Design a protein around this ligand. Structure first.
Ligand SMILES: *C(=N)[C@H](C[C@@H]1CCNC1=O)NC(=O)[C@@H]1Cc2ccccc2CN1C(=O)[C@@H](NC(=O)C(F)(F)F)C(C)(C)C
Ligand SMILES: *C(=N)[C@H](C[C@@H]1CCNC1=O)NC(=O)[C@@H]1Cc2ccccc2CN1C(=O)[C@@H](NC(=O)C(F)(F)F)C(C)(C)C
Ligand code: NA
Ligand code: NA
Lengths: 306, 306
């Protein structure tokens, strides 16, 4: 029993974190085989942040302008290139702790673990979602750039996020590991603002299923709804549309609990219209939307507390 | 910016997790140097759970009745002993990944990270507090026993919890790493029930300070309170007494924000009496009490967003 915001074990990623310095800027890099990946803005200077010409800035650098430190060992940079908004620094040493890994670009609504790092040293691990507006509600300070987000499947680390920017609302923007930003954001000091966000409907439903699995039914009702009618209510409450593919993805949780997806939708509709009335679900007074269906299956019992 | 339930990086603990089997019971152990620590109830059988005589059960076992597996390597048990409610299995191999470590018995209100494991394999990491009633609100299933809770300071892992039991309310009970239970709980299948819990006042205050650091002041007021008068309100809301030592511990957060501790107490008093009025603090609609003052200092900026 219980249900927590649960991150993946971070050890396989900890062994990949290094420190990268260029000029007076220090941030984190990801060391996989003989390449260190880091945000390209490591090459910027303070008076040229509004519209850096990264190609022009980088051609002016040599390999020895980049200092890479793994623990208390210096790695020598022997090549470099820019790919989108990341730098790839070829080093003289392959990381002996390189895990089995993939690079993945995730869809909005998917979750991942973040290993927050400073000066190449891991600080903490927490769970986040890619918001529909392609920001993440992270926890990041100066020096955190190059920290990565990831999922683990069996023994394979799927890296999906590298940290680059904080927006004025205190939320975060970054790239996949090929250096492509999520969302419309750029590595420039310009007016950027998160678009209006929405609630991840399929995740709220998954979490209601988690609550049932763990033994709570107070929020259920005898009603059902059509998908179309549910989506009319979703829109009114700033919830993402629920698609038939979402309904299919919720199949296993529906089967384990005996609650049809559209019946759980009627429960959610009533919660949106009436509120919780001072009650909680899985210890929360808000409807939680940063657990995917997969996250629920991963954490919860395969047997419902009936 | 941001503020998340943040666990410690788990890699140093992952390298210590092993699987322990006795009879038909399999659970997790902690492998440090040449000793594997695990719950003593690994030696129980299903028809003798009401009042096992552990001394009598253990004298009937030999070293070779215990199977220890680290990854896909079998470790040979070469000695065993019972200390309180843990078993210490001496093995033929010292763990080469043994971190710098300590065993600590924590006080109620302190937090720690849990590496949930099954069959010796880490599953996930989350943050918990030792509740005032000496339960923890964990997330644990069959096979999770022997999973550990820990804090990390510099390079030193302080182990403080090993998982043993789930109580009828779905909360969890376990021991320090010397095998002493937290709370009145025992490793017997008998009517046990968590005592009435209380809210960890000093932690709620720390988290209100976190909210101010991150730029939110909506809940402050112009009032102050005496410690005695605050504690009269705390008691009414099932909050732990705030001691002068708690006030001293909140000193650094008070200094960083410019809000006297007793002034923050007046803010909290008003929140308890009036509620949040539909507003949130750091994304929560409830008053959060599983961040210590240290946790806030560890995660938050040293500079307040004024
Ligand atoms: C990486 N170390 C750092 C992480 C930030 C610092 C505070 N919290 C975080 O998450 N990233 C930056 O400081 C980036 C780097 C950068 C590259 C190119 C041009 C300008 C910058 C300045 N950075 C910002 O995140 C700034 N944000 C913005 O300019 C915008 F809001 F995204 F537009 C700022 C936080 C104001 C420094
Ligand atoms: C460890 N693998 C397991 C963890 C449990 C299983 C479900 N969620 C958990 O956290 N621990 C047990 O199953 C223990 C072991 C034990 C030792 C001696 C005597 C009896 C048991 C049975 N266990 C329980 O946790 C049971 N709880 C209680 O008996 C009590 F509520 F604590 F009193 C029970 C969950 C009913 C199996
Ligand atoms: Na329903
Ligand atoms: Na006040």
């Amino acid at each position: 029993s219980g249900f927590r915001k649960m991150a993946f074990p971070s050890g396989k990623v900890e062994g990949c974190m290094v420190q990268v310095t260029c000029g007076t800027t220090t941030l984190n890099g990801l060391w996989l085989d003989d390449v260190v990946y880091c945000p390209r803005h490591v090459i910027c200077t303070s008076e040229d942040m509004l519209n850096p010409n990264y190609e022009d800035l980088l051609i002016r650098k040599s390999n020895h302008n980049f200092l890479v430190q793994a623990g208390n060992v210096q790695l020598r940079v022997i090549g470099h290139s820019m790919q989108n908004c990341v730098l790839k620094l070829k080093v003289d040493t392959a990381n002996p702790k390189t895990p089995k890994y993939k690079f993945v670009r995730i869809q909005p609504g998917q979750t991942f673990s973040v290993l927050a790092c400073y000066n190449g040293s891991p600080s903490g691990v927490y769970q986040c979602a890619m918001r529909p507006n392609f920001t993440i509600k992270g926890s990041f300070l100066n020096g955190s750039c190059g920290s990565v987000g990831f999922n683990i499947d069996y023994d394979c680390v799927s890296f999906c996020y590298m940290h680059h920017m904080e927006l004025p609302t205190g939320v975060h923007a970054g790239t996949d590991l090929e250096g492509n930003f999520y969302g419309p954001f750029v590595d420039r000091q310009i007016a950027q603002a998160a678009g209006t966000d929405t609630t991840i409907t399929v995740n709220v439903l998954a979490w209601l299923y988690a609550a049932v699995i763990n033994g709570d039914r107070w929020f259920l009702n005898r009603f059902t709804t059509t998908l179309n009618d549910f989506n009319l209510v979703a829109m009114k409450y700033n919830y993402e549309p629920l698609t038939q593919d979402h309904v299919d993805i919720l199949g296993p949780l529906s089967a384990q609990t005996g609650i049809a997806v559209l019946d759980m939708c009627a429960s959610l509709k009533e919660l949106l219209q009436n509120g919780m009335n001072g009650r909680t679900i899985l210890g929360s007074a808000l409807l939680e939307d940063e657990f995917t269906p997969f996250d629920v299956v991963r954490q919860c019992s395969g047997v419902t507390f009936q």
